[PDB]
Recover the amino acids of this structure.
């Protein structure tokens, strides 16, 4: 695992996270300020992270397609475009604003909050926060629906192969594409279901986190709809880093979805299967209890490309 | 230190906290529901807290004067009354609503959040959250002004002597009185000051957390104004458990003040010295950078008295 | 919590345990050896436990009624007798041999195993192991049935009041009475039940460990049958320290029950309600999935009384 | 170090382990079930291991020569054969049954036990456990003979070079060969020896774990007999992961030997030197205090090869 | 265990310590400065210690007999006098200067060093350091002779009864008497001995830390000479907190002895038995390998008495 | 990160360290002893380090230019020479003796001290310690001047690229060049300065560890003088591992500087800029508060080259 290195996509789950999404100002000065801050993001990452012996603090910067075109008009990753909104038969995935993403993780909340503070300070009037979630780990790697969340993530070389751009787009080798969606749950509706009904919605057993048998696995379970098999029988993964969040006084119980892929075609096909259904109409039952409030796609440059921005 | 015991006021600082303030509904049914939940608060405390081997989870329930009169009309602690608002020459301490306080602490946020979830679920329509703060520890026991915060707290027997009702009100022995105030900081104004100017505002050195020498200690420093000396030369302490909180996108940088005392006369005199000044006008410089958004006083019953509520 | 002190009944749950039950030889020399080892048990406890900085190692010695009569013929705790076997309408609680119990706990298995090794070495031919279980903590304080196990234990002063002999038998003040039963589960039968059926067997929700509502709580749930209410409405607790154990190759999935009480009348009434039923026949559903292989009652002397044995 | 990846041979020592050895049923259906479970072993490994933030859980699957021939008749690693039994002048190394090995390690026993439970459940009637040991770390990396055990293991690239198949058998690159032997000790005989006599048996000092000087090192010490030097003066290592186990009531004090090598010729030569002696008759003194109850050799396929099994 | 409370004698062993011994200047101003610093020692203790969440930092202040007479001429503990030097047949225990002792302990060296820095700064020219040792824990609670050191310490109530002044000197109830001696070892001479010879010098087995059998225990072992039995057969303990220290380049391998007792008669009798021998001449063999460079006795006032000093 | 591998330069910061510098004896026998010990340094490293489960212990051996010429007369790294002393306008960097460096790090002091003990024992009369510092981490990665120290270190591949010899000197690929300097501080002079004056001396803010703005950054700050930019605008880093040390009774407050580089030209240019100034005379203000007592340069051989020494 990388130590205090920007753009460390492959880091393991953490106890705390911060997801910041910002819009950049329209002026040339604002664009220059944003590029200065993000290209030098190793500065604040080390300024905060070096203070913890374990060096758990990580920070991944994503850049939206529209802002990318403002700063790197003549060179662009092959599949960078704004999040494509989905209108399913029942549920929809909106496309909401965002020019910059900071995906910050650490063993402690203070490290995440302080790095966010320093970044927001440095950006000043050049950018505006449009979404902010301070995520926390919930029991034994569970989400607020009470299921272990992240089990089938690829790890190690499989994670690198699934998440990072390779030979297919060599100018951007080592970058990634990340999609975020902030989901809010209907906990009263969810906790109406029996455990076995919930297991059929997800596709795994609840306490024990075991995938349902083939002959028990619904065609519209979350697991089935998010399993991506090509014509050669090869499976394709994304790398997810979801975290819980919420407010008891707003009855807000949330899962913040974040998913990295070497090609957003994989993540986008998962989203189509979830929202539109496979076959069409046979959509993901998780969406009957979970509403996406945001949806934004970013390019994650390699460190070399990030350092170059604004030049 | 107590293990999974309601009303454990003397617990040491923690990495995470939750401060919930609620108003109770006006109906007899709502009053009964509230009394049922709080008198049996050991249930949810153990249901959540037993799941962590260390047993770090604690929960202190406070009850406001007005709600107290609804449920225990014939027996009342000697000094229970609503928070008295202060109108200083420059700054004010408002008195804001609250019938119930839950002061929850643990080594992890999930334990605090889950206990809060279970309590809010159990109360249902009988109470409404009016303030909610998820506090976090910031570096080496610091607040967001960058000073170590809690240093001079009494510990052990001194803490018991300072915080818990004794022989002076024997029907309520082992209870306490707690005041909360949610403060928001003007960080841009604060970080205009030099370190030495900030040290003179607080009354201690910043990195090293050492009290200023007598000949360097201002008469309006926070330390001076919060030092309470009686005519016999005896000092009187309160027990504080402040925590950081905030939102980067709202430029909200907060200190949640919580202070326990065996007699609210001590806490109230501190507040008068801070807001009104000693001499009058010579008010606490911390308030030039910190604004109180809430102010609420609660009685913390002993476990025996808490268990009795609603009977 | 006590540090390296024999007879520390009130210790919190641990990650590892060892339960040893032995029978003493019939000779005077064997009796003397046993008394020498147990009266000086602080020796091995410190010899092993001092090697861990945290000092997590504890050791409680219990003595059976028959062996007690061999060594302290003229002075006996008021309620010491052999475990009374129960023959229920379906399930039975056998009374099985044991003169000595060592209930050993620590943060690590090696400390438990090494203390057991040293004790068995010291006893030599004077005693014979008749039951041995190396217990382990399972996830978030669960037993192998998948429920959090220990939630409603009394803690702190409530634990002392429930577990330790007081004014009622002053010659034995600070002692306790402990019952052990080694249970083996029918996991295939258990995992036939739905989650909700299992919750009705136990009396709490499974993942969330919340007691069922009064109007959902069966009369034959484990929680109902193990709730002991006297005529004055006062509840009576025992202090339990159960641990998981097993062998995959023997399909042995176990819960080792251990329960301390100041008067075995409480534990015995719980057992009658479980095995015989209340009303008679309405027995504890946990026993349809759990079979007791052992049942033995011991007196736990205070340290002062333990040190005196053999004199 | 790998995270939740099957066939992770190079993992560092752990606090807990589980060694399971099974025989597969004779039927085609049983063979298919076994291949299904082992080829998809990443499923249970993640189902259990993802629940611990640290991701300490590992699982290495070994396959015996006879079972290998049932499932991969046309492609076989160069040196796969059943364990060759040794008959020394005094001690013998038996060859005992085993078609499947699961070498499971984690920071906690529950993770090892739960993964074993899930694997045994999935195999059902298709395989039978023939050996099962739950290993534990003993003090500062010691075995039950009281010596630090594992000191001279190769680490990092040396470990990869020693344990993993390379260019010499490219169809099986990244696999390994593992031998297990379950040893039981005669502790009363061992603890007759002086410390210095024990140091001469092992070849290192006891408390300090320092190799004996050349002029003090016996020709039949364990260290000498297990040092493998080729004609070019190059040394050859194996990668060992021994753990303690035992039962106090059976006077069973055990060391579970497990050793990985890229070519079983190295491990086999060590065993010959130990049991037969070098020169013949000059056998390893450790065997005067340690008796091998099992002896079984397995091929450890790379992940790619493991995933392919049963196809 | 106490939290951030001066004069906490009963604290468990720690990973790091600092032993500071100082002489006070002769002037009235120097005496006043010393009394100001020590009576207010809770200030620096909290200033440093509050910065660690665990609150592991402790500080015990001792005051020498001569300095005591300068500051509290009309009230003195019953047994306060300067360390009495011993001249044995072979080895001697010198009496060396010291007016003030700070016995500082924590989980980390930085906390000990920083508290020492702040104390030395505050004392300035009013006192001079005459001995300074930064102690460290060595493996599993061992000293540099390789034996576990501290095993038979009293704990909990036994520690309070052994270390703290009670009804016998009520004006000083809760105080203690502490002796320090800095020992340097002859490691080359020690490591000439066999393990069994070393075990006979100490009185316990080396790796396993078990007291030798009565029929194997020499009359001049350290354990025998430091066992104090009165005419009624009652044993008397002291509370020790030894730590390792040293310098590789000076061939300095040290044990810092520190021992607390409610009456220095116990510690003094141990020292006589060690240095003079029982019978006379039969002195402690540890002293053939260990030379005392310092010897100083201090009174440890209760917190109340300490706070009063200089008034 | 490497596990128990000699010459592991890239290891992250640790809680404890030991820096040993020795001079070798002049005789052929002494040279042979030194080569035997250092070429086999993996022996003691594993003998000590394997005893800690985490395997935190590391040991890097450096060899001085003069000793190198005694043992490897026909093959030498391209830039190995003795430390070049600097005589600045105010401050000087002396060149002081040293043939061998051991840079030892671990999570605990005992591991560092014990490895040092074993190395010094093995060297015996063949080498003499000339400098010895036991370093400790101070708060949140700070030095005794109160600044976070190490922030801008390169990590991961940047660290390898900065510290390790590559294609430019292929016979020594994987080696490094290390310079040590032991600095003592004038704390009374330092703590005269305001925080802002100290920030201008260092080039970063003190509590928050943020680099000063370009328009606030002095030309003679430590950060400016230690920033190395080539004509192509490429920056060049060194890898530093400084630690605090000191003695309160000697008023010795120290920073032990240790810096690794693939070519000592980088470290030497930093030192020239610090001591001589850029422009000449504009020297580093840190040196007005910090005096170098030692200065020594060593070659750090790769493991392969180290193992070969003395052959
Ligand atoms: C409310 C939002 C969501 C919730 C509560 C949720 C929950 C879960 C859970 C409990 C699992 C099973 C354990 C695991 O393997 O991680 C899972 C699996 C998975 N989820 Fe989600 N998820 C959410 C949103 C999404 C979205 C938006 C995507 C895709 C764009 C996604 C992709 C996946 C994938 C790829 C798997 C692994 C399936 C497999 O191969 O077994 N999830 N999710
Ligand atoms: C924005 C809100 C506040 C901030 C940032 C703040 C900060 C601090 C700091 C940095 C210290 C010095 C270290 C310590 O001993 O804890 C301190 C001390 C203290 N504060 Fe506050 N505080 C706040 C509100 C309050 C309030 C509302 C009260 C009283 C009602 C209070 C009572 C005290 C007391 C009693 C002390 C100890 C003084 C002594 O005896 O040395 N604080 N506070
Ligand atoms: C009762 C069974 C055994 C015990 C108690 C035991 C114990 C030990 C101990 C205490 C050491 C020294 C520390 C170390 O470097 O690990 C050691 C070394 C070693 N053992 Fe064993 N061992 C056992 C079985 C085996 C077997 C069956 C093999 C080979 C098939 C083996 C191979 C090795 C090797 C290769 C070393 C390292 C020797 C060196 O290069 O210094 N051991 N063992
Ligand atoms: C008393 C001795 C020293 C002290 C107290 C000290 C302290 C510091 C501090 C507080 C920093 C800023 C945080 C950081 O990035 O590490 C720093 C940076 C640095 N120091 Fe030192 N240092 C000392 C000696 C040296 C020496 C002798 C060298 C070079 C031979 C050196 C090279 C560096 C470098 C390369 C940086 C990073 C500058 C940058 O690129 O931002 N230091 N030092």
């Amino acid at each position: 695992v990388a130590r205090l290195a920007p753009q460390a996509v492959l880091t393991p789950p953490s106890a705390a996270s911060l997801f910041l999404v910002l819009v950049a100002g329209d002026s040339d000065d604002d664009r220059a300020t944003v590029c200065d801050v993000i290209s030098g993001i190793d500065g604040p990452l080390k300024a905060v992270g070096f203070r913890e012996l374990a060096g758990s603090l990580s920070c991944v910067v994503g850049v939206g397609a529209q802002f990318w075109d403002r700063v790197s008009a003549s060179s662009k990753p092959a599949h960078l475009h704004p999040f494509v909104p989905l209108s399913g038969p029942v549920h929809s995935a909106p496309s909401t604003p965002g020019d910059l993403l900071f995906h910050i993780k650490a063993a402690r909340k203070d490290l995440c909050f302080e790095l966010g503070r320093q970044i927001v300070s440095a950006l000043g009037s050049a950018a505006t926060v449009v979404d902010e979630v301070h995520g926390f780990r919930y029991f034994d790697s569970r989400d607020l629906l009470g299921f272990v969340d992240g089990t089938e993530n690829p790890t190690d070389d499989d994670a690198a192969d699934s998440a990072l751009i390779g030979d297919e787009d060599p100018d951007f080798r080592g970058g990634s594409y990340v999609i975020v969606q902030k989901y809010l749950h209907d906990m009263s509706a969810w906790n109406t279901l029996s455990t076995e009904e919930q297991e059929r919605v997800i596709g795994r057993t609840k306490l024990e986190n075991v995938e349902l048998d083939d002959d028990a696995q619904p065609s519209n379970s979350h697991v089935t709809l998010n399993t991506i098999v090509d014509d050669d029988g090869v499976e394709h993964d994304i790398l997810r880093d979801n975290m819980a969040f919420g407010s008891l006084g707003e009855a807000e119980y949330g899962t913040y979805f974040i998913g990295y892929a070497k090609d957003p075609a994989v993540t986008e096909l998962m989203l189509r299967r979830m929202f539109l259904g496979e076959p069409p109409g046979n959509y993901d039952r998780v969406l009957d209890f979970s509403t996406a409030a945001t949806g934004t796609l970013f390019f994650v440059p390699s460190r070399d490309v990030l350092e170059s921005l604004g030049d």
Residues 138 and 244 of chain D are 7 Å apart (CA to CA).
